[PDB]
Amino acid sequence: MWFEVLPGIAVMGVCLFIPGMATARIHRFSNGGKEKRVAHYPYQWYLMERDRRVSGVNRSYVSKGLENID
Amino acid sequence: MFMINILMLIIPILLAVAFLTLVERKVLGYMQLRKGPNVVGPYGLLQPIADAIKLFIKEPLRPATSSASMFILAPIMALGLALTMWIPLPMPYPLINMNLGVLFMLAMSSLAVYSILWSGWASNSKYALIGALRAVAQTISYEVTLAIILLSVLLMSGSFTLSTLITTQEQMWLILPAWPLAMMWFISTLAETNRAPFDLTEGESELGFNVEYAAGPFALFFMAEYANIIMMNIFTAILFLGTSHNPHMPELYTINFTIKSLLLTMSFLWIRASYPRFRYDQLMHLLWKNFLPLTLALCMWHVSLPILTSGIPPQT
Amino acid sequence: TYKYVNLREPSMDMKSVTDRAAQTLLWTELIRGLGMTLSYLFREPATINYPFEKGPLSPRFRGEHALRRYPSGEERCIACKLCEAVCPAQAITIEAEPRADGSRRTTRYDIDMTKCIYCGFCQEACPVDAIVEGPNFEFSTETHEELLYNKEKLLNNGDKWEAEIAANIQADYLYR
Amino acid sequence: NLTLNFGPVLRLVMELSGEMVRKCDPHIGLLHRGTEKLIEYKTYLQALPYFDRLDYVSMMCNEQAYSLAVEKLLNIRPPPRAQWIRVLFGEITRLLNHIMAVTTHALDIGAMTPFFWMFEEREKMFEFYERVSGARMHAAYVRPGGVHQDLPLGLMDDIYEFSKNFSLRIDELEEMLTNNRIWRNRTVDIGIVTAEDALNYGFSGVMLRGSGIQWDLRKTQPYDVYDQVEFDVPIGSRGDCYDRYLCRVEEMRQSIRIISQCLNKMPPGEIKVDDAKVSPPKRAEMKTSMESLIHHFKLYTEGYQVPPGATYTAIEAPKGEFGVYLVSDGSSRPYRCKIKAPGFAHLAGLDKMSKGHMLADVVAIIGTQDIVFGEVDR
Amino acid sequence: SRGEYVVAKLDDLINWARRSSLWPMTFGLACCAVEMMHMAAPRYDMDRFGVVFRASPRQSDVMIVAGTLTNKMAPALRKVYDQMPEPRYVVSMGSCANGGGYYHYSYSVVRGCDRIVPVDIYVPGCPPTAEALLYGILQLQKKIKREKRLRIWYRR
Amino acid sequence: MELLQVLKRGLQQVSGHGGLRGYLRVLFRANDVRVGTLVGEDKYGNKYYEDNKQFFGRHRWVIYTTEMNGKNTFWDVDGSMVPPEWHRWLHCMTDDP
Amino acid sequence: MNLMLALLTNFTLATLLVIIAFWLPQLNVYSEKTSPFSMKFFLVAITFLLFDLEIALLLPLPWASQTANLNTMLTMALFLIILLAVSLAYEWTQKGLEWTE
Ligand SMILES: CCCCCCCCCCCCCCCCCC(=O)OC[C@H](COP(=O)([O-])OCC[N+](C)(C)C)OC(=O)CCCCCCCCCCCCCCCCC
Ligand code: SF4
Ligand code: SF4
Ligand code: SF4
């Protein structure tokens, strides 16, 4: 019957879900649980590099809050 | 971790292409009152694997090509570019977050014509060359409408960034304000990928250019061709059927976005089973006399419509 | 009597002309064709599950030639050669001589199943229901020489398919 | 001009000036088997199975043409019930041929789906062949004198159940082709034949009726009981592929109309002429009566003698006018048997019909002529 | 593990792939081509076995000769056979192709296609039923299943 | 409601073949898991089933034996394994087993 | 560096499949087998090129709509598209878009 066509669709459907699911998880793993920063324009890049210097550890995604201010 | 990311994109693409062959053979079967593969594995789930092994242990021809170096360059270029067109796709986060991603996909897509042209030369057959020339003239003709239609849509979006199309459709699908463009974009994607009713290459009784290829080299052209069918339908869903993105639950986007991308890929198989084939002079007239006049007119309309409503999108 | 197939004059009123403009621009009759293929997607396919299911046949089916016996075990053929005379392909070869007990019996009966056109004239000509075409249609071979039947192969077929051959002849001999 | 020997059972030698076809040169004979010479070493009954294999899509209509010719030289008449059977299966054969003609005409130009829907109908009609004769295709069921056997009980009910639903199958076929703009573009104003060129080139069948010529042998020179049934002859107006496609689709409907009358007006009686010097006796009376054994012996070894003479007999076969110029010398074996295949003259007009058309149109023009090379080459 | 054990299982993997994906090139010459179309029709649906309906000569694994081979056609047949990439099998369908059949004694007919090309399976009948050709195809699958190419190379 | 009944029949095929193991055995040998009425068994082990709700052509099928004449037929089934007495019923040349 | 790795992986992968495709069956040992310029096609390519170049001048339109001179910008945008349509009309009427000899 027609529903015997679905199992092929499920495999094809799952294979198109892995690339999207993998990229989202790998970014969070590599960016300390946050989305990967988006820097399309020079101003955004300048802030990101500044965050690298302010973190102490040379990482753009380690955010320092008020507790870092005297 | 980025290298792991690339493999998490490439292998699933090839597996999806492998099982698209099965799904195509079974959807076509049921629309023809039959079943399709259901013997090689349960419901034909091992049919793709059998076909792959068979082709890769079958002796290849490699005739007396005029070059013998274009014969090996053509499938490398086809498959190499086909996988490259996936790296900027937001699903919902791109592997490579390009600022001009929409323009990157046009650029790489226009290079796929060389593999059609080079394989024509390598075959060394005068007739096989004629088939390559007709295929090339078809591809370049219909990417005129891909470029202008895309420009018209981006006038309602404001950038060439692919992830900005997600923001643009955060209140409503672009299929609603731009359905006339969606129609001519959908048909223009069939012609680009040599799909019925535009498959003169595979349309025997008039000609294909990849006729001298067998075994593994033939499968490489096949894999690239089908990966482009999935990619163009993923592009269409992003462009005209935007899926809402929740930053806390990105998997929700991927499931909804995949279902749309599958439904549009099955529409390609649906259209193959329903219509006869265009004549070469008739698909050219469908472009130079019907689509192009409307595409140019709609481009004028979409340059002016945002201005006269005060609806110009932000640059950023 | 006769009828015209393509002799209609399309109306030229505004509503009719606009109807064909919507059809041209909105692809109405093409989407009408997509719906028909969609309906077949939800119909039960007509495929049968061969080899576990078989296609229906009838008692008159013409398959593998065979030589029959009387209920006593004596051969029905009496070397009359009517089948050899009527065979349009000249696929039958026969030789006969008096048997040890004096009966008129063959010493050769060959059918070339590659000359044969499976026409059934051999079993119409036979006056004693000796040469018949049975119901077996699955007897493909791997070599050309296995399809040149001799009297031993044909008598083995008759003993092998007698149970089904007799029942078919019982079901159809009233039409012959 | 560029020349292509497309080759392989048709070898086409064409010269093309770019996209246009400047000349078409069909090379045939790749299926010539010497049928007409073999018929001269056979009795009239032994040559009957050859005609199933000429136009192997319309098997039972080639038997009828050969049977009409022999019955004419014999000066005998088939019994009324046999004639009604020979019309019932003549129209069933006409459904088999038009499905093959239309659906393989559409499959060669891309539309592959209607082929599978309608070949499930052909399969069911192959059971009607198999239930009367025992063979799906080459029945050899129609013979000089009538038909070999009588219909088995219950077959006419199964023919009725099939015919009841067929008209719906045609409608689904027309939902895919008739109004589809892609189909029309491939078949409209393609291969236009003038009503005067068609007659002078030897055309017959829908090749004439497509150009407005009102001609059908079933109505003008009837045979068997075609003058006791009601049907309409489709007629074209533009003489192109599209009009000829509509004539075959509409002839499938007029066959269902004839079949509905054969099932209701089928008389009782015997199914072969009651003259045992032409048609063999019953097996029951062949095993009890001396004359019936003598006549069975001679009919299956020597065959019946046919008085000297020659005849040209023709029918309205599915593909056009099919006939034989049968010549007799007064013995059991025919002297000469020429076969007139409608596709022989139709394919000789391919060069004329393909002037000023593209190469891809030659595919459609070959399809619209409904060519089967079993009859073209013999 | 033994070498004779790995080769036995590798032989089963290549045989399984080859017999499960037979792509035929059909030489439809005469009436036997009609019965071959009914094998692709919905009733039997060759495609559900992995046997595609139509394949080009260079993408094909089996040649089905369905009809009468004439003397004007024989050179074309041999040319197509020589251009088939290996492994390649030939199925002879019908009396005409097997031995000439009804036209055996004709001046223009090759008496059997097996004197022009090698033949693996002979399917008898005039024509064979669509269920008889299908039985022959499944008999070619089992023949490919018995191949022992690797088990004979290992013993050279 | 009718959606529910479809799933119920899908489950009752698993129980109608003797659990999962029997259900999988007929899914890999026959590629079909329908359940029919047993009509009989021949001396070689073949089992014959009928289901008259199925459309003509699928209403009779045979599940071949796993061994015949000393040959392992678990995977290598063959249509010529049907003996003549059942060859007539299975091909619908008669209505009487 | 990321975009460079992505391109390297895709084309490196394609090359591997190609070479192992031409060699894996050659691990097998099969017996050795032994043994017009068209003008209209050229005009399609040239027409595409001139149309393709005019598209290059239209791609920056989305950024051009962000200016404070919309009256001037909208005048030239409709001029380029109108001129592109004039080229199509000229070829159409001069039988450029035909495939019949
Ligand atoms: C207030 C301001 C409003 C401004 C905008 C107003 C717009 C008004 C509407 C304008 C018309 C709409 C444009 C529609 C496109 C017309 C293109 C055209 O050329 O038509 C004629 C063309 C051809 O027309 P023709 O062949 O019949 O003849 C042309 C003219 N003569 C007769 C002179 C030759 O139609 C086609 O494109 C053929 C279709 C090929 C087969 C395609 C298969 C369709 C499968 C269904 C897909 C459904 C779409 C899926 C979309 C999914 C997207 C996610
Ligand atoms: S079926 Fe016909 S051709 Fe075959 S052996 Fe019998 S009489 Fe001869
Ligand atoms: S017709 Fe019958 S009895 Fe006479 S030779 Fe032939 S098989 Fe024997
Ligand atoms: S074997 Fe029979 S059906 Fe096949 S081509 Fe020859 S005569 Fe025709």
Swiss-Prot record, chain B:
It catalyses: a ubiquinone + NADH + 5 H(+)(in) = a ubiquinol + NAD(+) + 4 H(+)(out). GO terms for biological process: aerobic respiration; mitochondrial respiratory chain complex I assembly. The chain crosses the membrane at residues 2-22, 70-90, 100-120, 146-166, 172-192, 220-240, 251-271, 292-312. It comes from the Eukaryota. It is found in: Mitochondrion inner membrane. It is a multi-pass membrane protein. It holds the Pfam family NADHdh. One of its GO terms (cellular component) is respiratory chain complex I. One of its GO terms (molecular function) is NADH dehydrogenase (ubiquinone) activity. InterPro entries: NADH_UbQ_OxRdtase_su1/FPO, NADH_UbQ_OxRdtase_su1_CS. It is an enzyme of class 7 (translocase). Keywords: Electron transport, Formylation, Membrane, Mitochondrion, Mitochondrion inner membrane, NAD, Respiratory chain, Translocase, Transmembrane, Transmembrane helix, Transport, Ubiquinone. The modification N-formylmethionine is found at residue 1. Its EC number is 7.1.1.2. Core subunit of the mitochondrial membrane respiratory chain NADH dehydrogenase (Complex I) which catalyzes electron transfer from NADH through the respiratory chain, using ubiquinone as an electron acceptor. Essential for the catalytic activity of complex I. Essential for the assembly of complex I. Core subunit of respiratory chain NADH dehydrogenase (Complex I) which is composed of 45 different subunits. Belongs to the complex I subunit 1 family. HAMAP family: NDH1_NuoH. This is NADH-ubiquinone oxidoreductase chain 1. It comes from Bos taurus (Bovine).
Curated annotation (Swiss-Prot), chain C:
It catalyses: a ubiquinone + NADH + 5 H(+)(in) = a ubiquinol + NAD(+) + 4 H(+)(out). Core subunit of the mitochondrial membrane respiratory chain NADH dehydrogenase (Complex I) which catalyzes electron transfer from NADH through the respiratory chain, using ubiquinone as an electron acceptor. Essential for the catalytic activity and assembly of complex I. GO terms for molecular function: 4 iron, 4 sulfur cluster binding; metal ion binding; NADH dehydrogenase (ubiquinone) activity. Belongs to the complex I 23 kDa subunit family. This is NADH dehydrogenase [ubiquinone] iron-sulfur protein 8, mitochondrial. One of its GO terms (biological process) is mitochondrial respiratory chain complex I assembly. Core subunit of respiratory chain NADH dehydrogenase (Complex I) which is composed of 45 different subunits. This is a component of the iron-sulfur (IP) fragment of the enzyme. Interacts with RAB5IF. Coiled coil: none annotated. Its EC number is 7.1.1.2. It is found in: Mitochondrion inner membrane. Keywords: 4Fe-4S, Electron transport, Iron, Iron-sulfur, Membrane, Metal-binding, Mitochondrion, Mitochondrion inner membrane, NAD, Oxidoreductase, Repeat, Respiratory chain, Transit peptide, Translocase, Transport, Ubiquinone. It is a peripheral membrane protein. It is an enzyme of class 7 (translocase). It comes from Bos taurus (Bovine). [4Fe-4S] cluster 1 binds at residues 77, 80, 83, 126. One of its GO terms (cellular component) is mitochondrial inner membrane. Signal peptide: none annotated. Binds 2 [4Fe-4S] clusters per subunit. The chain holds residues 37 to 212 of 212 of the full protein. The keyword Transferase does not apply. [4Fe-4S] cluster 2 binds at residues 87, 116, 119, 122. Its main location: mitochondrion. The gene is NDUFS8.
From Swiss-Prot, chain D:
It is a peripheral membrane protein. It catalyses: a ubiquinone + NADH + 5 H(+)(in) = a ubiquinol + NAD(+) + 4 H(+)(out). It comes from the Eukaryota. It is found in: Mitochondrion inner membrane. Its EC number is 7.1.1.2. One of its GO terms (biological process) is neurogenesis. One of its GO terms (molecular function) is NAD binding. The modification Symmetric dimethylarginine is found at residue 33. [4Fe-4S] cluster binds at residues 241, 247, 262. Its cofactor is [4Fe-4S] cluster. Dimethylation at Arg-33 by NDUFAF7 takes place after NDUFS2 assembles into the complex I, leading to stabilize the early intermediate complex. Binds 1 [4Fe-4S] cluster. Disulfide bonds: none annotated. Its main location: mitochondrion. One of its GO terms (cellular component) is respiratory chain complex I. Keywords: 4Fe-4S, Acetylation, Electron transport, Iron, Iron-sulfur, Membrane, Metal-binding, Methylation, Mitochondrion, Mitochondrion inner membrane, NAD, Oxidoreductase, Respiratory chain, Transit peptide, Translocase, Transport, Ubiquinone. Belongs to the complex I 49 kDa subunit family. Core subunit of respiratory chain NADH dehydrogenase (Complex I) which is composed of 45 different subunits. Component of the iron-sulfur (IP) fragment of the enzyme. Interacts with NDUFAF3. Interacts with NDUFAF7. Interacts with CERS2. This is NADH dehydrogenase [ubiquinone] iron-sulfur protein 2, mitochondrial. It comes from Bos taurus (Bovine). The chain holds residues 79 to 463 of 463 of the full protein.
Swiss-Prot record, chain F:
This is NADH dehydrogenase [ubiquinone] 1 alpha subcomplex subunit 12. Belongs to the complex I NDUFA12 subunit family. Keywords: Acetylation, Electron transport, Membrane, Mitochondrion, Mitochondrion inner membrane, Respiratory chain, Transport. The modification N-acetylmethionine is found at residue 1. Complex I is composed of 45 different subunits. It is found in: Mitochondrion inner membrane. It is a peripheral membrane protein. It comes from the Eukaryota. The keyword Transmembrane does not apply. Accessory subunit of the mitochondrial membrane respiratory chain NADH dehydrogenase (Complex I), that is believed not to be involved in catalysis. Complex I functions in the transfer of electrons from NADH to the respiratory chain. The immediate electron acceptor for the enzyme is believed to be ubiquinone. The chain holds residues 1 to 97 of 145 of the full protein. GO terms for cellular component: mitochondrial inner membrane; mitochondrion; respiratory chain complex I. The gene is NDUFA12. It comes from Bos taurus.
